[PDB]
Design a protein around this ligand. Sequence first.
Ligand SMILES: CN(C)CCc1ccc(Nc2cnn(C)c(=O)c2Cl)cc1
Length: 120
Amino acid sequence: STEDAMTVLTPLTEKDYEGLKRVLRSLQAHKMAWPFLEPVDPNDAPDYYGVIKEPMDLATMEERVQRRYYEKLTEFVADMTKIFDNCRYYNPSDSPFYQCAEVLESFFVQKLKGFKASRS
Ligand SMILES: CN(C)CCc1ccc(Nc2cnn(C)c(=O)c2Cl)cc1
């Protein structure tokens, strides 16, 4: 669609980056974001970094947003998706972390759709 191709191809502008920061800030304020605010502490999960190839967290994405690391929205969505995919890969489905990933990913999808709608 218009938004799917924009998402893949349209370079992110400074104006886009205001929208990206708003989305990230709203995730960081969400009640269910607590497991994802900061990198996974190895002492919470001793085998985590031997298993998870590309860790991700909201503080690392905040740094990348500040530095204009992302050229396309697809790259931003991929980093965010890693947070939730890593969590569901490593944890059982009845884990509170896994449940937080399900709730926060649905919230991110709601916010991401709003952001894509306003790029016009
Ligand atoms: C040092 N801490 C006890 C602080 C509390 C805390 C912070 C973040 C997490 N986040 C984790 C942890 N372990 N694993 C396997 C995960 O997947 C995730 Cl998302 C947990 C506790």
